[PDB]
Symmetry: C3
Subunit: 508 residues, 3 copies
């Protein structure tokens, strides 16, 4: 225990058993149990989904309401004009929006963007009849709601909190625990409380990352089946997941940050090209008209959508969608808010709140109205039988089918194939990075994490994906999200309370 041991900040690199082992053990144990009996796992998975959504769905809904309220408080309250770092923004306002407008590009987004409208239209909210005109007229509006300005505004409290911690308090924050000192004290932060918090967070994050794989993988393999004729099987999925891991491993080992960043740029520009293409050849005039109509419908129904539980009719719509999506929002809040904070030094509180909500919803509104308007038309015109395609082949095939129904079919599918593939590479890279940084001992800033830790995490995330795929269907992915959401409900609130308490003292 010597010598010269406590004569400075820690300054050495490696794993921190505090937070490295428990996640590994917990996710490992869960994977093993899931695989023991896939049919009984699915039975429990379904019971967990139904229980949380039906019994605690209301709390997820009130969380979004409160956070939405917070956005107004930030935009109009005492902090509106506070600068987040006295320096000038490190980006032009345009590159700043472009960076948000770019982070919207993802594989999960192409998944839900392409298919969620089919579900809204066939099993409508508010007791409407499946496939009726009124079901069709509310379909996109409900996307504009679940992926619009309201959900994005709920990230504002956390984004401002983190930019305040980074740039006014000048704290290095990696783990949630590090922001809670104003709230519970250093004893609790550094003790067991802060350890549990950080471990619950990491588990939720790990599961969430697996779900991203679980959704992105089948899209890529359906593209592969369509383009090359290689049949989509669970083995093809395990093969592609392996390639991503190896690719990641080669990128990390040889430190190709430069190349990965360029890939990130290509995915962003390909996204624009692909959406623009779908718009131009998918029925531009209908899409513009349908979007316009859906805005007014969204504005009218919004308060109804925000507080919807269907307690009389019990059709289950809010439970299946709103609660699940809100859990998705809650799971990714800290992660997304940190990234928004980082690109926002020098901006004012109100500037951050207005800009992020503007640029981010532009991104998501565009994706869901173009892909959703395409899908809706294909259903309307009987070009596809989506129910039949799903019952036979699975959801990912039905999605690929909405893409291949467009002109220049083979070229279009090349575009999408490339998009979903690079997106997943940059997602794996980013995922492995975050997990490594969060489970290793405090290391000098600007330094990359221990390589073997980083690769090891990518492998565990890949395992989770293949199991989710083995389990089959949407339900396992949805329940992993709902599960992770439950703890992070409390973690998110704790970080914002911590910010609010600190700000009383150091922001006046």
């Amino acid at each position: 225990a010597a010598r010269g041991s406590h004569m400075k900040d820690n300054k050495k690199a490696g794993i921190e058993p505090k937070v490295f082992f428990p996640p590994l053990i917990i996710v490992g144990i869960l994977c093993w149990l899931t695989v023991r009996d896939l049919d009984a796992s699915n039975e429990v998975i379904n019971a967990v989904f139904s229980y949380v959504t039906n019994v605690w769905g209301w709390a997820f809904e009130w969380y979004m309401v409160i956070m939405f309220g917070g956005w107004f408080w930030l935009v109009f309250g005492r902090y509106a004009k506070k600068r987040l770092g006295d320096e000038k923004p490190e980006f032009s306002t345009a590159s700043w929006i472009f960076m948000m407008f770019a982070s919207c590009t993802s594989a999960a987004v192409l998944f839900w963007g392409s298919i969620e409208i089919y579900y809204y239209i066939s099993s409508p909210p508010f007791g409407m009849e499946g496939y009726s005109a009124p079901a069709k007229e509310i379909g996109l509006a409900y996307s504009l709601f679940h992926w619009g300005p309201l959900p994005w505004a709920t990230y504002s409290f956390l984004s401002v909190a983190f930019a305040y911690f980074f740039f006014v308090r000048k704290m290095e924050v990696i783990r949630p625990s590090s922001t809670l000192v104003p709230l519970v004290g250093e004893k609790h932060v550094n003790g067991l409380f802060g350890t549990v918090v950080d471990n619950f967070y990491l588990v939720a994050l790990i599961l969430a990352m697996g779900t991203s794989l679980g959704l992105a993988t089948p899209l890529v393999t359906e593209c592969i089946q369509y383009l090359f004729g290689i049949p989509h099987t669970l083995q093809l999925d395990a093969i592609i997941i392996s390639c991503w891991i190896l690719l990641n491993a080669i990128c990390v080992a040889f430190g190709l940050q430069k190349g990965v960043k360029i890939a990130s740029d290509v995915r962003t520009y390909l996204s624009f090209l692909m959406l623009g293409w779908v718009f131009i050849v998918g029925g531009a005039s209908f899409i513009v008209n349908y979007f316009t109509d859906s805005v007014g419908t969204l504005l009218m129904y919004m308060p109804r959508m925000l507080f919807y539980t269907d307690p009389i009719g019990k059709g289950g719509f809010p439970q299946a969608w709103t609660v699940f999506y809100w859990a998705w929002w809650v799971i990714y809040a800290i992660q997304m808010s940190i990234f928004l904070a980082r690109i926002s030094k020098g901006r004012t509180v109100r500037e951050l709140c207005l800009g992020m909500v503007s640029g981010l919803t532009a991104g998501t509104w565009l994706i869901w109205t173009i892909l959703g308007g395409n899908t809706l038309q294909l259903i309307d015109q009987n070009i596809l039988n989506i129910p039949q395609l799903i019952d036979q082949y699975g959801v990912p095939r039905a999605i690929i089918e909405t893409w291949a129904a467009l002109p220049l079919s083979t070229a279009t599918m090349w575009g999408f194939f490339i998009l979903c593939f690079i997106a997943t590479v940059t997602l794996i890279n980013a995922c492995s990075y975050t997990l490594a940084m969060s489970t290793c001992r405090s290391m000098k800033e600007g330094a990359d994490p221990p390589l073997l830790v980083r690769i090891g995490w990518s492998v565990l995330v890949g395992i989770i994906g293949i199991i989710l795929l083995a389990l089959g269907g949407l339900k396992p992915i949805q329940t992993a999200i709902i599960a992770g959401g439950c703890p992070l409900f409390f973690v998110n609130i704790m970080v914002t309370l911590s910010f609010i308490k600190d700000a009383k003292v150091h922001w006046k």
Copy 2:
């Protein structure tokens, strides 16, 4: 006419014939006529209800709209930051809310809270079908509307006006007339104009107080019938009303202010216990879910509910409920606003407007969603046949039946019995006090009113209750409220105009 007669402020105690005799004569004459022929009275009662609501319902609706607008003007306008008395508030912000949150406890509230949803659900607005899902889905929302933030916000103009008169102008105000000097001048105030105004007010108030009895009494006697087996009759009602009068008389004569105040505290805490109990054992999960859903529905329909007259379909919904309840709101505005003003010295205008609307609706929202969600479930599950119970026994019995349907039935009914009983004691005490103070000569501050005047008024109010009960049903109570509302429509407006005019001069 001497001597030394006008060498100071009046400083002596007794009745003021200006305002003591006319009310007595008017209410006496009305009681006598009503009793002459109960069946013809009821016929006229019904015709007065239908006429005012159908022909002048729109004016009651626009009154609430304007007053609601005024709330925004107060919160965002030139007066927002004005303090109501330069002193520090005489209560902590918590005890201040608790005092509003406490004034919500009443017998009339348990009456309407328990039953109004049955009516909304069986004879729905907007042409919906009775007992349909959509009727059930709007039922609580319509309670959240009639007893929510909008009606409470309409008291803000009067509450601010009175706190301005009490604490900035330092005027002793008892009667409405005393605030009108800036508006019509001292001649009119002290002359016939101010006398008519104060007499119309007192008559409306007297009728309104009778209706409180008329509603509270049958609840207590249904509790008595349930608990002790004593059949509910008109004679049992006259007996209980007598006991309240005697109780009041003993409390006043021996000056037991201390004890009455403690009773007030018990009723407040019993209310919390009873509502909490109903919530915990009445279907907590359904109640939370139904409340959440109803908020969104309320937010969506609010503008429609605010301006509703049903002029095409003529189903009569707004006339039966909204207009009647708005008359109820209008009748009690001055009284409630004076009480809100008194507990608000030292608060700013905006503080008063935000706090009262927050604390008061918390109180009323809780009462109507718990009691209404209980009742709705009992109807849903066919535990009770409310229509049958009402046709056979009357509304009060159906209400008691929703309470007795809960676990620990006998204990629960003891809780409610005690609640409605003490509530009525403190209501009678407060009622008799106000009437005495308003009909007697200006007396030195902090002094209790002439005892025989005070008891005499409690007796006249008791008479009005027993007649209302003799008349039977809801209609007589509703028409007395609508009748009183008509004059006070103009009185309320006069006080706020008076405040607005004065404030131009003395508040800048």
Copy 3:
């Protein structure tokens, strides 16, 4: 080319070939082609209507949304407190409102005010059933929308822009082109760009003026047929149009500005008398109740109405009405905004925005609810068969029939006859004035335009009316409006961008 030619501002009077000839040629050519084959013109007219509304209707809708947003920016933004001229307003606030509240009086307003509800009720939006209760309950609300605070608020940007140009920049502005210097530069303004802009504007205006005639004329002749027995024919219409032209010619030639102004005053006061009469004897109680109900319905549906395209059901409602009316709004924006600017010197930006929206909607709300509530009742009670009347005689006859159905039938029709007649005289006078001023060389301020130019334009406008009448029905009038609207979509936006750019520099 001499001498002393460029030693001052131009200072001489006559036509400016830049902008005098092209309009004349273009409208002349169009008139001639239209008349060549009335049945084929109507076929093309119908195809132009369907194409613009269906394909580009969305752009008209987003234009109103953006302009509406601008109103909030003006009321709450950096310019809210800027004064439009440092002088004191040249009118009392009352005479200022009265002047807006007066400009609402017109023949076109009596036309649409009287009949549009019949169309809303018989061919309802949102897939409702014709003549159903819900169709009737939304009917007036849709008038309150198309002629309410939202459309009036969209004039605020242009009204503020022109008052800024007139009173802060002290520029003489007659033609749109003259405001674009900050936007495109003097070269473009004085060159071809500014010439095209001003010519497109003048053509749109000329067509629009013809439509006013095309609507006002048949109302007057139906009144003439009703009162005097003279059969309504195309020849009677050509005769009345001639009388207006001659009347105008006599008024202009002998410079009877005084008398025309008095006529303007009479029309204003007659309007009040006629509306007040219709209200008092047309079912006051129903009208008050129906208006109240319609406000709440309007507030609830507004966001839905604002963004409505009906892309699924394709019932065509928004295309037939909203898009057409928005084109009407767009066509008259510059003209109306100049007039609002002129009567608003010395007012602040926010004052102009609040006052104009308040006074103007008071005017239009009153007209459409009184005339629309009258018409609705006549349909409800089966006093008239409007469809039958229209198929047989045309729309103008059905309108006159709603007026003649009121008590004192002969006197009422005298009132309306006089109203529509003087209204059209003052409209022709104002129209001819504007066209003259816009097509003639810059002349010294306060000077009347060349008389023969002024009369000549009134004649061309009269021709356009008679052709529109020869074409028959509503469609030609609607398509001329939609046609003119398309160019002025861009002209309106250009003036506001020009104002915004200039204001950055000279308003701080």
